[PDB]
Ligand binder design. Structure first.
Ligand code: SAH
Length: 327
DNA sequence: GATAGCGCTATC
DNA sequence: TGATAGCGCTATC
């Protein structure tokens, strides 16, 4: 994350729906706002949350009487995306995990926060010929909110990872907010190699495999793109090796493959996956963040998390628009 | 709950 | 196209 001294969101209160690791917290808190509620049902995520914020989230949002949710100004939600990702069986709203948005909508209908800040994957924008986004747009518009959205790739915001997400910022119609804008991109100056941990601490993750077919030669110049170097096995998800001179490929949560969830990188002659701390770093988490003890749950956790640095810029601009109340 | 082999889609 | 990527899917222990 980056330091932000101009704390635009200082007096505001927000809720962290679908908490996960708490990325949305970190993001908004660095901007001065305060978290009044958090919700997350996964047993392991709750533990990491508690270990890092001292609060244990409420359970199954589905059976939470919305009226119980504390008065808030910003509603943050990085709702589930198995149902819309280009990586699955795109069952959209027909999937048991694709209707959470409607849960957001009922919390919004009742509580009416000034801002709704949501996040999901790039394909949510194209899914079902854009009908899902349309349902989300029209549902939001019907509850008296403006709907702003754009696909932003993290590598354009200081983090060496190709995580293309769609961010939807919604403002209550009252506040005539007509000057919101998404952070302007900027040149990448940090690559995977800059975040790697010292070899000594990584040893146990090296994976020498005989089917390591090297398909491309290492690069001399750093590039803001994923340079694939090798393939292992048939080269499916998890069995592709990239150069530490490019940018990390999207980290995933249920991913498989020998280099499961993080992908595999060629670090100093050796082929290995990423340590949980390097995922934290590749996601923009501060090194002070306590990662969960179970490496498998840590990777799952960072896999469906969010790139803080990006949310920081957006939260900042969300704050600016709200604070422009001239006479 | 932890592991890994798979097999599909979107995008230009 | 032809090659790459993907907050994934699911069987086995
Ligand atoms: N019904 C439900 N109630 C509560 N949490 C749920 C849920 N369905 C899914 N979740 C949780 O929703 C989260 C989506 S991932 C969001 C991660 C979060 N933005 C962070 O930065 O890490 C997952 O942790 C998932 O376990």
């Amino acid at each position: 994350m980056i330091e932000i001294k101009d704390k635009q969101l200082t007096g505001l209160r927000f809720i962290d729906l679908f908490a996960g690791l708490g990325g949305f917290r970190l993001a908004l808190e660095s901007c001065g706002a305060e978290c009044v509620y958090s919700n997350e049902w996964d047993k392991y995520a709750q533990e990491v949350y508690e270990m890092n914020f001292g609060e244990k989230p409420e359970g199954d949002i589905t059976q939470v009487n919305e009226k119980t949710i504390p008065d808030h100004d910003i509603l943050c939600a990085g709702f589930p995306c198995q149902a819309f990702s280009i990586s699955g069986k795109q069952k959209g709203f027909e999937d048991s995990r694709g209707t959470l948005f409607f849960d957001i909508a009922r919390i919004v209908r009742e509580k009416k926060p000034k801002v709704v800040f949501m996040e999901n994957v790039k394909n949510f924008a194209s899914h079902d010929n854009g009908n899902t986004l349309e349902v989300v747009k029209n549902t939001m518009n019907e509850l008296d909110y403006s709907f702003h959205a754009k696909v932003l790739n993290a590598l354009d915001y200081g983090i060496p990872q190709k995580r293309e997400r769609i961010y939807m910022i919604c403002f209550r119609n009252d506040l005539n907010i007509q000057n919101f804008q998404f952070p302007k991109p900027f040149e990448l100056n940090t690559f995977v190699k800059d975040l790697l941990l010292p070899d000594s601490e990584v040893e146990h993750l090296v994976i020498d495999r005989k089917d390591l077919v090297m398909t491309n030669q290492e690069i001399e110049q750093t590039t803001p793109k994923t340079v694939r170097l090798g393939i292992v096995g048939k080269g499916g998800q998890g069995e592709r090796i990239y150069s530490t001179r490019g940018i990390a490929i999207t980290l995933s949560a249920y991913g498989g493959g020998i280099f499961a969830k993080t992908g595999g990188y060629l670090v100093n002659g050796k082929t290995r996956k990423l340590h949980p701390r390097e995922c934290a770093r590749v996601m923009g988490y501060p090194d002070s963040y306590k990662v969960h003890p179970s490496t498998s749950q840590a990777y799952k956790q960072f896999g469906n998390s969010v790139v803080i640095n990006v949310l920081q810029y957006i939260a900042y601009n969300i704050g600016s628009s709200l604070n422009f109340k001239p006479y």
